[model samples]
Target: CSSDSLQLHNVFVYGSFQDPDVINVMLDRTPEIVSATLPGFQRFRLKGRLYPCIVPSEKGEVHGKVLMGVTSDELENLDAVEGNEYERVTVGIVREDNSEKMAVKTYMWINKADPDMFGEWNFEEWKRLHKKKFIETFKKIMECKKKPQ
Candidate 1:
């Protein structure tokens, strides 16, 4: 028995986790990533919140990046953070460059469409408006949640 037996899970991140700075603070390291698309999913901005959530939809496509080489420990942290609001699910990711598709894990909003969820979430807008505060707060959150080892 060894840690080597643990399987790596690639995750398609469409929200704040898509940013390198956020990923760095969350996992304490940056993993390789490639721009990809998740078809049949639409990303929407949650009302009164600075983040976004995604849900399945016909005729929808979401643009995001796939984080590769996500280890078990790293995924545990992600699960803790997103478990309440989202559900982890396996989905097909289509790489932008070659159209190659592979199954990857992703977090989807647990609830269906709601009056609180508005139009598409924009990365550029989020960077300008909320990235700074989000990074600062996120660091503290992760720090407090670090494993006791």
Candidate 2:
């Protein structure tokens, strides 16, 4: 990677980052995330049963996080790990006080062509339902890191 690429130092996270278990996996057990929050974008349930598939509603808010100091390599790893479920996009992130400015990369659901299934998206509710699955997947990914493929 060139110096320019190295200059990049951020990752935009939606979905599971709101859950600590999933965020820990992205930080690779280093706990480097400085802060996290949700952008004003609204998260809507997709027409299908995909757990994290959401449409960015024009008039609501979506909760997520902005992880700082994320390297280019880390971004690549994240993109690979997230698979085809989401697409990476550059977005502007504002602080809680709405005073600070930051540029972050976030993943948006790409399957928007499908009708959005109707349901409420509650962070706390999602955590309760999916935390275990998230942790299990995280552990599996970590175990895979232990050996060469």
Candidate 3:
């Protein structure tokens, strides 16, 4: 049992979700975003994909942002968006504001030995190259989720 007054149920994001535009479409509402860092982890490019994936790594640190006060329903949306490629897990993040360490949920690659993981992923490059098309496709995916099957 741990006690932390912050009830925000925050989530740390290191991939395309780091982009405000992408996040807005994913969650339908823009929540508070705070720059944060996750230690002991490495972020890598997913197999020929537009996004990235993270995995535990010693002496590694990933710079990302946190979405504050994520609700349960929003979490389900995130889970579906992420699909089976990742697994939701709790990790400690150091907020840039006060350098405070706190627990936040993040997605990690399910296959540690994934052959497709490679190189580094640049957010700016992604935004320039794929943001537009990605958002269009992403929006459609979310839309399809709304209709009853």
Candidate 4:
């Protein structure tokens, strides 16, 4: 359990999803974003992919944004967007507003990342080269997910 003010099921987004363009397309609505950082973890480049993963790193910290007031449907969309390789977990985030640390749900890489992979994930580079394609492809994927099942 969490305190009332901190109990809001906020979602932290890093990597490609941190892109406003990517998030807007993913959610179909612009949710309020608050700058935050998750200590004790690092964002690693997904091998050769545009995505990233949050893996354990004591000296590392993941700087990203928190999505407040996330709804149920949005959670479903996010879960799909993150794919099965990610597992939901809660971590403390330093809010940019007052630097208050609170628990927020986020995706963590499951079964671990490829040990052969190295180097940091470049979000800016992905936005420049791969974002347009990702957005288009993700839109199609979301559409498929929306079909009656």
Which candidate leads the pack in TM-score? 1
Give per-residue CA lDDT, model 1, range 1-149, as digits (tens). Answer: 11122387688897768888888888787767888889888788754563578888785777899888778888988888888788889898898879798778899987885757667567435635766777766667775688331
- Kindly report which residue stretches of model 3 are placed more than 4 angstroms away from their true locations once superposed: 1-8, 121-149
lDDT of each: 0.77, 0.58, 0.74, 0.71
* Per-residue lDDT of model 3, residues 7-39, tens digit only: 545788877677778777776776678888888
Positional deviation of residue 43's Cα in model 4 after best superposition, in angstroms: 0.7
lDDT of 4 by residue, 101-143 (tens): 8788898877565664356556435535765776776666766
Q: Write the per-residue lDDT of candidate 2 for residues 1-149, one digit (tens) a residue.
A: 11132455666565555455765576563323534344555565433356555455554455555566556676787787675677777766665445575666777777656554445667546646777787776776766689432
Ranking by TM-score: 1, 3, 4, 2
Instruction: Please count the clashing residue pairs in each candidate, in the order shown.
Output: 0, 6, 0, 0
* TM-score, one value per model: 0.73, 0.59, 0.70, 0.68
Instruction: Indicate the residue-level lDDT of 58 in model 2.
Output: 56
Better of 1 and 2 by TM-score: 1
Model 3, C-alpha of 136: deviation from truth (Å): 46
